Amino acid sequence: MPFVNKQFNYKDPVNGVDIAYIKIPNAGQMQPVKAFKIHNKIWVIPERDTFTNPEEGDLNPPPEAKQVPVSYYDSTYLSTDNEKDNYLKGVTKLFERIYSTDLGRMLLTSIVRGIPFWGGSTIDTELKVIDTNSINVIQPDGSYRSEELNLVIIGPSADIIQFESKSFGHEVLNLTRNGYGSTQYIRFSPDFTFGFEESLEVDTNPLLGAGKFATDPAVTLAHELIHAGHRLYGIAINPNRVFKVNTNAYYEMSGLEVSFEELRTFGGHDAKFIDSLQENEFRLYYYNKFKDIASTLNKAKSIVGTTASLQYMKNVFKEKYLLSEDTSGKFSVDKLKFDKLYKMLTEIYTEDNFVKFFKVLNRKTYLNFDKAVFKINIVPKVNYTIYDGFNLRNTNLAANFNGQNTEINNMNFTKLKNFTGLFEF
């Protein structure tokens, strides 16, 4: 069964249900943008993100510096209807490629179940929604209705290749780290990809290689979806917790620090740089958060709003958090169940495991150096498919990851920028 029932076209008429002009409630003032609901709880906005961050409201290139050195600017990308149509089709195709794998079906199911907690009440006896976990949808009569959602895929902001799962903050609460969760906005483009090097000694050296192989963008989207899963379950690791990398002399020359949240998300050997003591600390911390959620639930005796029953919403959260329910109706956290869900979200859903399901070549570690950015077009089936990505069966591209080989499959990649040697190491 496909993940996305509808093969939307960008110019399909609005209907106020799954094709609609919307606003993001605390982006602040914005004009409505056309958006597409591709699955329960999941929307796609084919626009550059000038909305989620007040200080990132324009796309022009210039010299705030060339920092991060890995960056790419084009203020015109994703400004036309044809681009937006292709964006919507590309994103859809990547969701289908992900969903076609058992691991991706598991991850997307977890994401859909991961409704942001109704932790907005100032009154313990009432359960209430946090309104930054919604969008405002223009209805056919021109009025707005509030719709809760879990995930939005949106185009990148000024730096086209800066992909990220981000979310609106709360005055008091760290929603992504307190077990609550919050609606995630993933800046992403299917229209570009990264180069990497097939030899580890080259890929992890900042001075070598031009980016012979292209990352499959399904892996890149999966990576961001894994962050969104952490953040929807409120178990993201504070970016302040960093591996002050000491396993790569070039990282060390520039004092490069990599978050534990990134090492977790990559998985494989990288995750082992989070030591067992610190893993246990995080596991304890988050277990404690789930406990607070159970207590909050138990204290609630009425629901606020007319959307759903209080039993419906307690069941939603009992299912999300896999809570136990006692004879009196008290919720509790079962330690075996917590450890299993935590482990599913953090050890099973990893970039390294997706590479195994997609059978693609990929970076072997997050602790490498980016080589290049390429323009791509995955929408034509002659270029890329749900089942094979670039490595099309029964062609010269089927074997040896030849489809990802940008030299062999050169028609599918246009190098836009080299990053090798730009680095200060």
**Site residues, Zn ion (CB under 5 A):** 262
The continuous run of DSSP H or E covering 151 comes out as: strand 151-155
Q: Which residue is catalytic, options 96, 224, 261, 351?
A: 224
State CA 229 to chain mean position distance. 8
DSSP code for 26 = T
Which is closer to Zn ion, CB of 104 or CB of 403?
104
Phi and psi dihedrals of 343, rounded to 5? -60, -40
Strands 151-155 and 42-48, sheet pairing: parallel
224 is catalytic: yes
C-beta of 165: minimal distance to Zn ion in Å?
A: 8
Distance CA 217, CA 53 (A): 25
Which is closer to Zn ion, CB of 91 or CB of 333?
91
Which is closer to Zn ion, CB of 88 or CB of 245?
245
Distance CA 10, CA 13 (A): 8
C-beta of 228: minimal distance to Zn ion in Å?
A: 10
Which is closer to Zn ion, CB of 159 or CB of 262?
262
Distance CA 9, CA 78 (A): 15
Which is closer to Zn ion, CB of 96 or CB of 262?
262
Which is closer to Zn ion, CB of 219 or CB of 372?
219
State CA 423 to chain mean position distance. 26
Distance CA 40, CA 42 (A): 6
Distance CA 194, CA 217 (A): 8
Label residue 176 exposed, middle or buried (CB < 10 Å: 0-12, 13-18, 19+): buried
- The answer to whether the CB of 107 falls within 8 A of the CB of 226 is yes
Q: Tokens in use for 34? A: 């056309």
Strand partners, 195: 214, 372
| Amino acid in position 296 | T
Q: Pick out the residues of the known binding site.
A: 223, 227, 262
State CA 306 to chain mean position distance. 31
Which is closer to Zn ion, CB of 136 or CB of 353?
353
**Residue 72, SS3 per DSSP:** coil
Phi and psi dihedrals of 177, rounded to 5? -135, 10
C-beta of 366: minimal distance to Zn ion in Å?
A: 8
Q: Pick out the residues of the known binding site for Zn(2+).
A: 223, 227, 262
Residue nearest to Zn ion (CB): 262
C-beta of 164: minimal distance to Zn ion in Å?
A: 8
C-beta of 421: minimal distance to Zn ion in Å?
A: 24
C-beta of 186: minimal distance to Zn ion in Å?
A: 11
C-beta of 287: minimal distance to Zn ion in Å?
A: 24
Label residue 227 exposed, middle or buried (CB < 10 Å: 0-12, 13-18, 19+): buried
Q: Tokens in use for 265? A: 């998300």
Neighbours of 239 (CB within 10 A): 12
Distance CA 70, CA 385 (A): 28
Catalytic residues: 224
